[PDB]
DNA sequence: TTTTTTTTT
């Protein structure tokens, strides 16, 4: 009750990339665009292919709903078909030419793959981690996929699973290793071992079978001009507060980023993400791994409702009544939020620095619609954060020492303002904060920089 | 042999001495224990009660017979007596009940065996407690405190009620409270 | 009915609409309308006992004349004498079991009684019982020509039963 | 053993016509195809109604459970199979039972070893519970040298089949290929553990509470959380233990579960909607609504209406950019000492679902709203969100604990930044407060606002405030003290003199004081209510023109023509308040649509709210 | 163990 032939699932798959199509703007014929990237791949201007599963879903093709129902139920295994054909279409289109040699593992396989010169022995000498050097990454847009953390459970292991959450932490860039290769002493000969997981174990004893037989007892040696590495990043995303259930506080899940979809998000950022559930090798610890990732905060090109606009001109009083129009009035307050939410320019004077942006402070009688106004300029913004008066300590505007109670270790974590960097802060109830902590913002209102020495660290922010 | 046994009790026990499973602990396999130690009435006791109720003079020598060896204090032994046999207890259809307690505070100098007679309320009592939390331990018993120049909610609602950091809970029973002070 | 109209009244609102017995009968079946039942005799398994002491055994039939794989069948008789307390009234029994009692085995029964001359001092009647009738009640009540009766006074001039 | 075969599939097959009976009277093949189209996998059994039909299958499935419970199994698969629908579900099908115990009805106490291997059913509260985690069932692995595919499966002592293997991950082929796993085929399940104690109603005076172990997989994971009172029904059974070849003969005990019921709410019938329909079509309802609220409290009408508006409450809006408007409605009960303030409040928590009460006089504010404990924890207005917070003594909190209130009471939020946690927190829910005023009784020589002594921005949050006061008048005093003996006379007309407590109208009503007109049963309200907070009216011009006109005439009106005095501010707020109490009185209608009829009466409260004439000592 | 920090009572 299963199929494995896997000829025809390519053939398949290769047909999808054949005949989807979108017309051209002007009506004048049609892209390829799938094909296009595949070319750019060959020609080595990129490094990954990021594949819309519901084009698939919708395009105009035999058995399409069954290959897009295939690729969902196991993610994992279709990984490798793509691939596999994506490296057949670039052999294609490649021909008897060379692709250009860029890095030491591509200029370590073009010389040693002529060495060996000088089919069945390249696919059986190589793996094909090794022999293939781009990336597959799968995406979903209907509402089927969309989950919460909260709702990932046995029945996703294994599955392409969609979601959208907030980032709590997030580690700096690391090598990962995947595929090792070890070289003998005394006969020569090289070991590949691909790596899967987070653990590997390293063989001691050479394999080759004349090394063996004459029991020359050879060491093996690993190199890292042969072996592989690549980008690994980890993250923890946190549950968005819409999706929570009542009187309940949001749940956490740890997920590991591979390749160019790292550096795409730090922390105080809003995501959608991609990604298959898997198990760590009874009971089971689990984890996500990413696919896809896309900033909310930040998503040449150009609206025509902008066009119209910028075409138009005068726009200083159309612009002052769109901030928040369900609030009456208050003409030259919208006019005031207006320039804080541009603000002026930096000056760097014979190494004396002046800030550029503008503070604001409204006051007024109870019921006339502060909160409603600093609540649309938090939506409004693109980076920005919103607190209180009585939520808030100085410590949490600035930023904090922890310490860990698992190695003793001392840290900073950066505070609201820290988070805010670059963006806009909103303070409601400021009368009602404590001296002692309204005294923190003294620095940053004017310097722009937050100076710490507590315990054993001494920075600046 | 299990479940024969609470803690406080005085005991004589027949047992073989081991040593657990080159030094051991010591315990005993024990092979025998021997202890060194209401709401059901007879026809008798309900005829010795109706005859009491049946005197004319009975109110009159319940509150006398409260404390004898302290002298006097004629007022306060008949409002012991009504603490300790309270009202009804009432609850109407809208599910708003009434309670039946009563308490009664003692006001003055510290002396005048007030101590003795809170003793005395917590002995005769069916349930009851004497002390200077303490407050929840008696349903449907009276708790008598000393020294209360040392609630509102507990005395009104039969409840107290906490939301401090991390919890809130609500602790309820029912109790009639008697209270000696020295001077809220 | 009213059920249809509330369900319709919440609907009308916006309101989410998720907020016979008669004990024990008889029947009867007139003219081309028997075939069906017969069809569903030979059919179902609510008559074919598939749970129990009579697991796969089929239904009784009986009959009063011969058929293909009938076989012939006697009730079981018996009889006692009781006598008391120096009376003239010694009484004696007769007892007919373990089978089915057809309605012909009475009508005969009356002529053993009559033929024997038991009813010759009329004033010392003889009596007779059937008994578990109620089990297959109804039968009687399709015709004028039958009637429902549990206990029967048997003389020579006449039968009597009570109005039941 | 071929016996026990034969026996096994008489059992079995017993089960199987019992389940798919050709005329079904229990009708379990309609509940199989309910289950099978709603696409769960276990089927709830009456353990009294298998009593009648096989009872040598019943009394035999206490003490031989664990047989008579997978022969049971097996003859629902095949149940299933004779469908036309298809078996989805990877995972087999399941079953759980109720009825009735008996002999084994127990506590944790009262479980000892006589029952080990026998189906109960125990009582208790959760004390403890692991978070929920998934454990491997079968795996399947692909060959790529041979393109041949292998399988595996796994068991456990925790797992109800008594059968074992090796359960040794599979890495290699006989002919010693690598193997790759297949995640998308293998098969796995949710697991958790809780633990259960002895009720504090049972537990004997003075020891320690006994506690229970307890087992759940599949569909019965994520479904209590510590302080559920539970009732839990499952096989008891011990499970051994090894270390280097020596084994301690103390074995633990578990409870492995089939069927979970929680003991801590509305049910309807058509005869209950027929009269639901003619309440609704009556001539006033709310009026009728409002006197059946409260009966044996005498006078505080005005209040009452209050306080079912409170419990309908307003519409929230949001709009097309996101904004948000709230719809919640804010009451505050300022007055003199024994004015049944604490006793309103008491009747509100019993007749609100999701309510929690609290006192101003040990609360936190961030006990109040929210705690870092490092960890983030929920105060009580966090856990009343979509409720009704009650506070008492609302005048003996600290300001400093005050201040913390302001953003829920408006946005329906909590948002905290401190060390290491930064986080918002939804808290929309419906505060109804109760206060005594600043002098400890009410001094009618200052006017409200000092006797109610807080501050505008905080005043202003309330939809409805209401000043009462304790006036010596001897009409009065009459009126309300026969009322109360009234009520303390009182007793049930079936019942006898020497006794002790340990439809639609209501029949016997001396206790409430009102004479003649007729009340509605509590049930009734609770049906009522629960039905009409569902209805979603609009609103309409008429409306809006006398909502616009009224705001401006109670804004502009002067209190020194006519000898009276201001109790509230009138700001933009309450002009939301005029639309929120029109909207909650046009729901009690069952209207679609907020009238003329509807704002009236909403201004007609407010009006009363807002002003009141001078004490009588000054007058 | 002793030391240093930030939230809570
Ligand atoms: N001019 C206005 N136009 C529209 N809505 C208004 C206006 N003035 C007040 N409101 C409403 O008044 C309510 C209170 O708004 P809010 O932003 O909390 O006032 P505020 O200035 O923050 N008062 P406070 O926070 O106690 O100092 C909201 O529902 C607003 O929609
Ligand atoms: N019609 C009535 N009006 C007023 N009080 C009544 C009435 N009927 C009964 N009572 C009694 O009066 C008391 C009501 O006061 P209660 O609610 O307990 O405290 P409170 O009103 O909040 N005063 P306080 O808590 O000291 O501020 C109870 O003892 C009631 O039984
Ligand atoms: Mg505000
Ligand atoms: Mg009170
Ligand atoms: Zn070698």
Same mark, same amino acid.
């Given at each position: 009750?299963?199929?494995?032939?896997?000829?025809?699932?390519?053939?398949?798959?290769?047909?999808?990339?054949?005949?989807?199509?979108?017309?051209?703007?002007?009506?004048?014929?049609?892209?390829?665009?799938?094909?296009?990237?595949?070319?750019?791949?060959?020609?080595?201007?990129?490094?990954?292919?990021?594949?819309?599963?519901?084009?698939?879903?919708?395009?105009?093709?035999?058995?399409?709903?069954?290959?897009?129902?295939?690729?969902?139920?196991?993610?994992?295994?279709?990984?490798?078909?793509?691939?596999?054909?994506?490296?057949?279409?670039?052999?294609?289109?490649?021909?008897?030419?060379?692709?250009?040699?860029?890095?030491?593992?591509?200029?370590?396989?073009?010389?040693?793959?002529?060495?060996?010169?000088?089919?069945?022995?390249?696919?059986?000498?190589?793996?094909?981690?090794?022999?293939?050097?781009?990336?597959?990454?799968?995406?979903?847009?209907?509402?089927?996929?969309?989950?919460?953390?909260?709702?990932?459970?046995?029945?996703?292991?294994?599955?392409?699973?969609?979601?959208?959450?907030?980032?709590?932490?997030?580690?700096?860039?690391?090598?990962?290793?995947?595929?090792?290769?070890?070289?003998?002493?005394?006969?020569?000969?090289?070991?590949?071992?691909?790596?899967?997981?987070?653990?590997?174990?390293?063989?001691?004893?050479?394999?080759?079978?004349?090394?063996?037989?004459?029991?020359?007892?050879?060491?093996?040696?690993?190199?890292?001009?042969?072996?592989?590495?690549?980008?690994?990043?980890?993250?923890?995303?946190?549950?968005?507060?819409?999706?929570?259930?009542?009187?309940?506080?949001?749940?956490?899940?740890?997920?590991?980023?591979?390749?160019?979809?790292?550096?795409?998000?730090?922390?105080?950022?809003?995501?959608?993400?991609?990604?298959?559930?898997?198990?760590?090798?009874?009971?089971?610890?689990?984890?996500?791994?990413?696919?896809?990732?896309?900033?909310?905060?930040?998503?040449?090109?150009?609206?025509?409702?902008?066009?119209?606009?910028?075409?138009?001109?005068?726009?200083?009083?159309?612009?002052?009544?769109?901030?928040?129009?369900?609030?009456?009035?208050?003409?030259?307050?919208?006019?005031?939020?207006?320039?804080?939410?541009?603000?002026?320019?930096?000056?760097?004077?014979?190494?004396?620095?002046?800030?550029?942006?503008?503070?604001?402070?409204?006051?007024?009688?109870?019921?006339?619609?502060?909160?409603?106004?600093?609540?649309?300029?938090?939506?409004?913004?693109?980076?920005?954060?919103?607190?209180?008066?009585?939520?808030?300590?100085?410590?949490?505007?600035?930023?904090?020492?922890?310490?860990?109670?698992?190695?003793?270790?001392?840290?900073?974590?950066?505070?609201?303002?820290?988070?805010?960097?670059?963006?806009?802060?909103?303070?409601?109830?400021?009368?009602?904060?404590?001296?002692?902590?309204?005294?923190?913002?003294?620095?940053?209102?004017?310097?722009?920089?937050?100076?710490?020495?507590?315990?054993?660290?001494?920075?600046?922010? | 042999?299990?479940?024969?046994?609470?803690?406080?009790?005085?005991?004589?026990?027949?047992?073989?001495?081991?040593?657990?499973?080159?030094?051991?602990?010591?315990?005993?396999?024990?092979?025998?224990?021997?202890?060194?130690?209401?709401?059901?009435?007879?026809?008798?006791?309900?005829?010795?009660?109706?005859?009491?109720?049946?005197?004319?003079?009975?109110?009159?020598?319940?509150?006398?017979?409260?404390?004898?060896?302290?002298?006097?204090?004629?007022?306060?032994?008949?409002?012991?007596?009504?603490?300790?046999?309270?009202?009804?207890?009432?609850?109407?259809?809208?599910?708003?009940?009434?309670?039946?307690?009563?308490?009664?505070?003692?006001?003055?100098?510290?002396?005048?065996?007030?101590?003795?007679?809170?003793?005395?309320?917590?002995?005769?009592?069916?349930?009851?407690?004497?002390?200077?939390?303490?407050?929840?331990?008696?349903?449907?018993?009276?708790?008598?405190?000393?020294?209360?120049?040392?609630?509102?909610?507990?005395?009104?609602?039969?409840?107290?009620?906490?939301?401090?950091?991390?919890?809130?809970?609500?602790?309820?029973?029912?109790?009639?409270?008697?209270?000696?002070?020295?001077?809220? | 009915?009213?059920?249809?109209?509330?369900?319709?009244?919440?609907?009308?609102?916006?309101?989410?609409?998720?907020?016979?017995?008669?004990?024990?009968?008889?029947?009867?079946?007139?003219?081309?309308?028997?075939?069906?039942?017969?069809?569903?005799?030979?059919?179902?398994?609510?008559?074919?006992?598939?749970?129990?002491?009579?697991?796969?055994?089929?239904?009784?039939?009986?009959?009063?004349?011969?058929?293909?794989?009938?076989?012939?069948?006697?009730?079981?008789?018996?009889? =006692?004498?009781?006598?008391?307390?120096?009376?003239?009234?010694?009484?004696?029994?007769?007892?007919?079991? =373990?089978?089915?009692?057809?309605?012909?085995?009475?009508?005969?029964?009356?002529?053993?009684?009559?033929?024997? =001359?038991?009813?010759?001092?009329?004033?010392?009647?003889?009596?007779?019982?059937?008994?578990?009738?109620?089990?297959?009640?109804?039968?009687?009540?399709?015709?004028?020509?039958?009637? =429902?009766?549990?206990?029967?006074?048997?003389?020579?001039?006449?039968?009597?039963?009570?109005?039941? | 053993?071929?016996?026990?075969?034969?026996?096994? $599939?008489?059992?079995?097959? $017993?089960?199987?016509?019992?389940?798919?009976?050709?005329?079904?009277?229990?009708?379990?093949?309609?509940?199989?195809?309910?289950?099978?189209?709603?696409?769960?996998?276990?089927?709830?059994?009456?353990?009294?109604?298998?009593?009648?039909?096989?009872?040598?299958?019943?009394?035999?499935?206490?003490?031989?459970?664990?047989?008579?419970?997978?022969?049971? $199994?097996?003859?629902?698969?095949?149940?299933?199979?004779?469908?036309?629908?298809?078996?989805?579900?990877?995972?087999?099908?399941?079953?759980?039972?109720?009825?009735?115990?008996?002999?084994?009805?127990?506590?944790?106490?009262?479980?000892?070893?006589?029952?080990?291997?026998?189906?109960?059913?125990?009582?208790?509260?959760?004390?403890?519970?692991?978070?929920?985690?998934?454990?491997?069932?079968?795996?399947?692995?692909?060959?790529?040298?041979?393109?041949?595919?292998?399988?595996?499966?796994?068991?456990?002592?925790? @797992?109800?089949?008594?059968?074992?293997?090796?359960?040794?991950?599979?890495?290699?082929?006989?002919?010693?290929?690598?193997?790759?796993?297949?995640?998308?085929?293998?098969?796995?399940?949710?697991?958790?553990?809780?633990?259960?104690?002895?009720?504090?109603?049972?537990?004997?005076?003075?020891?320690?509470?006994?506690?229970?172990?307890?087992?759940?997989?599949?569909?019965?994971?994520?479904?209590?959380?510590?302080?559920?009172?539970?009732?839990?029904?499952?096989?008891?059974?011990?499970?051994?233990?090894?270390?280097?070849?020596?084994?301690?003969?103390?074995?633990?005990?578990?409870?492995?579960?089939?069927?979970?019921?929680?003991?801590?709410?509305?049910?309807?019938?058509?005869?209950?909607?027929?009269?639901?329909?003619?309440?609704?079509?009556?001539?006033?309802?709310?009026?009728?609504?409002?006197?059946?609220?409260?009966?044996?409290?005498?006078?505080?009408?005005?209040?009452?209406?209050?306080?079912?508006?409170?419990?309908?409450?307003?519409?929230?809006?949001?709009?097309?950019?996101?904004?948000?408007?709230?719809?919640?409605?804010?009451?505050?009960?300022?007055?003199?000492?024994?004015?049944?303030?604490? $006793?309103?409040?008491?009747?509100?928590?019993?007749?609100?679902?999701?309510?929690?009460?609290?006192?101003?006089?040990?609360?936190?504010?961030?006990?109040?709203?929210?705690?870092?404990?490092?960890?983030?924890?929920?105060?009580?207005?966090?856990?009343?969100?979509?409720?009704?917070?009650?506070?008492?003594?609302?005048?003996?909190?600290?300001?400093?604990?005050?201040?913390?209130?302001?953003?829920?009471?408006?946005?329906?939020?909590?948002?905290?930044?401190?060390?290491?946690?930064?986080?918002?927190?939804?808290?929309?829910?419906?505060?109804?407060?109760?206060?005594?005023?600043?002098?400890?009784?009410?001094?009618?020589?200052?006017?409200? @606002?000092?006797?109610?002594?807080?501050?505008?921005?905080?005043?202003?949050?309330?939809?409805?405030?209401?000043?009462?006061?304790?006036?010596?008048?001897?009409?009065?005093?009459?009126?309300?003290?026969?009322?109360?003996?009234?009520?303390?006379?009182?007793?049930?007309?079936?019942?006898?003199?020497?006794?002790?407590?340990?439809?639609?109208?209501?029949?016997?009503?001396?206790?409430?004081?009102?004479?003649?007109?007729?009340?509605?049963?509590?049930?009734?309200?609770?049906?009522?209510?629960?039905?009409?907070?569902?209805?979603?009216?609009?609103?309409?011009?008429?409306?809006?023109?006398?909502?616009?006109?009224?705001?401006?005439?109670?804004?502009?009106?002067?209190?020194?023509?006519?000898?009276?005095?201001?109790?509230?501010?009138?700001?933009?707020?309450?002009?939301?308040?005029?639309?929120?109490?029109?909207?909650?009185?046009?729901?009690?209608?069952?209207?679609?649509?907020?009238?003329?009829?509807?704002?009236?009466?909403?201004?007609?409260?407010?009006?009363?709210?807002?002003?009141?004439?001078?004490?009588?000592?000054?007058?």
């Amino acid at each position: 009750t299963y199929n494995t032939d896997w000829a025809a699932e390519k053939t398949k798959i290769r047909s999808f990339f054949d005949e989807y199509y979108v017309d051209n703007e002007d009506g004048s014929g049609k892209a390829f665009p799938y094909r296009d990237q595949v070319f750019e791949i060959a020609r080595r201007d990129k490094q990954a292919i990021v594949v819309n599963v519901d084009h698939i879903k919708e395009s105009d093709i035999p058995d399409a709903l069954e290959l897009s129902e295939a690729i969902t139920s196991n993610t994992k295994r279709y990984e490798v078909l793509f691939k596999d054909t994506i490296s057949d279409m670039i052999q294609d289109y490649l021909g008897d030419k060379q692709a250009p040699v860029i890095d030491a593992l591509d200029a370590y396989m073009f010389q040693r793959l002529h060495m060996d010169r000088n089919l069945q022995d390249k696919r059986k000498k190589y793996p094909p981690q090794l022999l293939q050097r781009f990336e597959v990454y799968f995406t979903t847009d209907d509402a089927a996929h969309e989950t919460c953390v909260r709702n990932i459970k046995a029945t996703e292991i294994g599955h392409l699973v969609s979601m959208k959450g907030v980032v709590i932490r997030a580690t700096e860039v690391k090598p990962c290793v995947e595929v090792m290769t070890y070289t003998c002493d005394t006969c020569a000969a090289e070991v590949y071992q691909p790596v899967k997981g987070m653990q590997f174990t390293p063989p001691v004893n050479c394999p080759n079978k004349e090394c063996v037989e004459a029991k020359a007892n050879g060491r093996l040696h690993m190199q890292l001009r042969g072996s592989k590495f690549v980008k690994f990043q980890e993250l923890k995303i946190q549950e968005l507060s819409e999706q929570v259930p009542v009187g309940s506080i949001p749940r956490t899940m740890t997920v590991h980023v591979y390749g160019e979809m790292t550096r795409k998000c730090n922390t105080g950022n809003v995501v959608h993400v991609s990604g298959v559930f898997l198990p760590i090798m009874l009971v089971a610890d689990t984890y996500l791994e990413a696919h896809y990732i896309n900033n909310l905060d930040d998503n040449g090109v150009q609206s025509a409702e902008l066009e119209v606009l910028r075409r138009k001109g005068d726009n200083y009083e159309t612009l002052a009544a769109s901030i928040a129009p369900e609030i009456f009035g208050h003409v030259d307050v919208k006019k005031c939020l207006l320039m804080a939410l541009v603000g002026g320019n930096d000056n760097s004077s014979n190494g004396m620095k002046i800030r550029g942006c503008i503070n604001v402070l409204m006051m007024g009688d109870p019921g006339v619609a502060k909160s409603q106004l600093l609540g649309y300029v938090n939506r409004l913004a693109p980076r920005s954060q919103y607190t209180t008066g009585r939520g808030s300590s100085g410590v949490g505007l600035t930023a904090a020492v922890m310490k860990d109670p698992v190695t003793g270790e001392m840290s900073l974590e950066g505070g609201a303002l820290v988070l805010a960097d670059g963006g806009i802060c909103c303070i409601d109830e400021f009368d009602k904060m404590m001296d002692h902590d309204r005294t923190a913002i003294h620095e940053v209102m004017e310097q722009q920089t937050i100076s710490i020495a507590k315990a054993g660290i001494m920075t600046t922010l | 042999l299990t479940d024969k046994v609470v803690p406080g009790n005085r005991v004589t026990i027949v047992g073989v001495y081991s040593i657990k499973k080159g030094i051991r602990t010591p315990y005993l396999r024990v092979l025998g224990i021997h202890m060194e130690t209401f709401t059901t009435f007879t026809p008798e006791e309900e005829r010795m009660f109706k005859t009491l109720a049946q005197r004319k003079d009975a109110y009159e020598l319940i509150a006398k017979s409260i404390a004898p060896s302290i002298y006097g204090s004629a007022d306060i032994k008949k409002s012991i007596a009504c603490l300790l046999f309270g009202g009804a207890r009432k609850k109407l259809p809208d599910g708003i009940t009434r309670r039946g307690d009563i308490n009664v505070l003692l006001l003055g100098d510290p002396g005048t065996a007030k101590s003795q007679l809170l003793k005395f309320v917590e002995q005769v009592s069916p349930i009851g407690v004497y002390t200077s939390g303490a407050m929840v331990l008696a349903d449907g018993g009276v708790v008598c405190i000393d020294e209360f120049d040392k609630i509102h909610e507990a005395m009104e609602q039969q409840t107290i009620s906490i939301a401090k950091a991390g919890i809130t809970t609500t602790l309820n029973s029912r109790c009639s409270v008697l209270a000696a002070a020295n001077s809220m | 009915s009213p059920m249809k109209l509330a369900n319709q009244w919440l609907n009308e609102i916006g309101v989410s609409p998720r907020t016979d017995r008669a004990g024990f009968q008889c029947l009867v079946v007139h003219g081309s309308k028997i075939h069906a039942l017969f069809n569903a005799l030979m059919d179902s398994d609510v008559v074919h006992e598939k749970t129990g002491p009579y697991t796969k055994i089929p239904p009784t039939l009986i009959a009063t004349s011969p058929f293909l794989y009938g076989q012939l069948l006697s009730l079981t008789k018996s009889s =006692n004498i009781f006598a008391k307390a120096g009376t003239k009234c010694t009484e004696y029994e007769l007892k007919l079991e =373990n089978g089915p009692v057809l309605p012909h085995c009475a009508k005969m029964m009356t002529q053993f009684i009559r033929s024997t =001359n038991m009813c010759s001092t009329e004033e010392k009647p003889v009596t007779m019982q059937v008994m578990d009738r109620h089990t297959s009640q109804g039968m009687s009540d399709w015709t004028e020509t039958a009637t =429902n009766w549990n206990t029967v006074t048997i003389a020579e001039n006449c039968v009597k039963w009570t109005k039941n | 053993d071929r016996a026990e075969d034969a026996r096994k $599939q008489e059992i079995t097959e $017993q089960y199987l016509n019992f389940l798919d009976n050709q005329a079904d009277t229990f009708h379990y093949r309609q509940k199989i195809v309910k289950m099978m189209n709603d696409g769960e996998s276990r089927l709830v059994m009456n353990l009294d109604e298998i009593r009648e039909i096989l009872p040598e299958r019943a009394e035999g499935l206490l003490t031989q459970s664990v047989l008579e419970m997978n022969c049971l $199994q097996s003859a629902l698969q095949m149940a299933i199979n004779r469908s036309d629908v298809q078996a989805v579900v990877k995972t087999g099908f399941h079953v759980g039972f109720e009825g009735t115990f008996g002999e084994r009805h127990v506590n944790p106490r009262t479980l000892k070893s006589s029952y080990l291997g026998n189906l109960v059913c125990c009582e208790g509260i959760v004390t403890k519970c692991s978070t929920v985690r998934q454990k491997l069932l079968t795996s399947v692995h692909y060959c790529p040298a041979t393109n041949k595919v292998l399988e595996k499966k796994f068991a456990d002592f925790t @797992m109800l089949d008594t059968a074992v293997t090796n359960n040794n991950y599979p890495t290699e082929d006989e002919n010693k290929n690598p193997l790759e796993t297949e995640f998308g085929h293998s098969v796995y399940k949710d697991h958790q553990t809780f633990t259960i104690q002895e009720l504090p109603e049972s537990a004997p005076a003075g020891q320690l509470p006994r506690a229970v172990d307890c087992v759940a997989d599949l569909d019965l994971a994520d479904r209590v959380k510590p302080g559920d009172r539970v009732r839990i029904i499952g096989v008891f059974r011990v499970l051994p233990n090894k270390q280097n070849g020596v084994s301690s003969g103390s074995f633990r005990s578990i409870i492995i579960i089939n069927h979970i019921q929680m003991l801590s709410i509305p049910n309807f019938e058509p005869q209950d909607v027929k009269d639901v329909r003619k309440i609704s079509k009556s001539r006033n309802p709310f009026e009728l609504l409002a006197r059946s609220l409260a009966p044996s409290i005498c006078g505080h009408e005005e209040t009452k209406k209050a306080l079912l508006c409170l419990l309908l409450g307003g519409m929230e809006k949001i709009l097309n950019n996101g904004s948000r408007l709230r719809g919640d409605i804010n009451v505050l009960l300022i007055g003199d000492p024994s004015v049944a303030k604490s $006793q309103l409040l008491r009747y509100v928590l019993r007749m609100a679902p999701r309510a929690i009460t609290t006192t101003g006089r040990g609360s936190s504010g961030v006990g109040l709203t929210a705690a870092v404990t490092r960890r983030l924890e929920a105060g009580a207005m966090v856990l009343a969100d979509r409720g009704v917070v009650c506070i008492d003594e609302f005048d003996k909190m600290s300001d400093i604990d005050r201040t913390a209130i302001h953003e829920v009471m408006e946005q329906g939020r909590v948002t905290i930044s401190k060390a290491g946690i930064h986080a918002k927190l939804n808290a929309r829910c419906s505060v109804l407060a109760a206060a005594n005023p600043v002098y400890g009784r009410y001094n009618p020589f200052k006017s409200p @606002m000092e006797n109610i002594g807080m501050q505008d921005s905080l005043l202003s949050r309330f939809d409805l405030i209401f000043v009462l006061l304790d006036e010596h008048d001897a009409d009065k005093d009459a009126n309300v003290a026969e009322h109360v003996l009234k009520l303390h006379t009182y007793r049930t007309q079936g019942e006898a003199d020497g006794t002790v407590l340990p439809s639609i109208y209501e029949e016997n009503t001396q206790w409430a004081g009102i004479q003649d007109t007729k009340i509605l049963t509590m049930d009734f309200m609770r049906k009522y209510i629960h039905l009409a907070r569902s209805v979603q009216p609009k609103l309409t011009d008429e409306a809006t023109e006398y909502i616009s006109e009224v705001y401006a005439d109670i804004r502009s009106f002067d209190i020194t023509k006519t000898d009276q005095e201001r109790t509230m501010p009138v700001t933009a707020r309450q002009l939301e308040t005029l639309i929120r109490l029109s909207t909650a009185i046009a729901k009690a209608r069952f209207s679609k649509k907020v009238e003329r009829e509807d704002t009236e009466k909403a201004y007609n409260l407010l009006h009363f709210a807002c002003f009141k004439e001078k004490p009588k000592a000054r007058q």
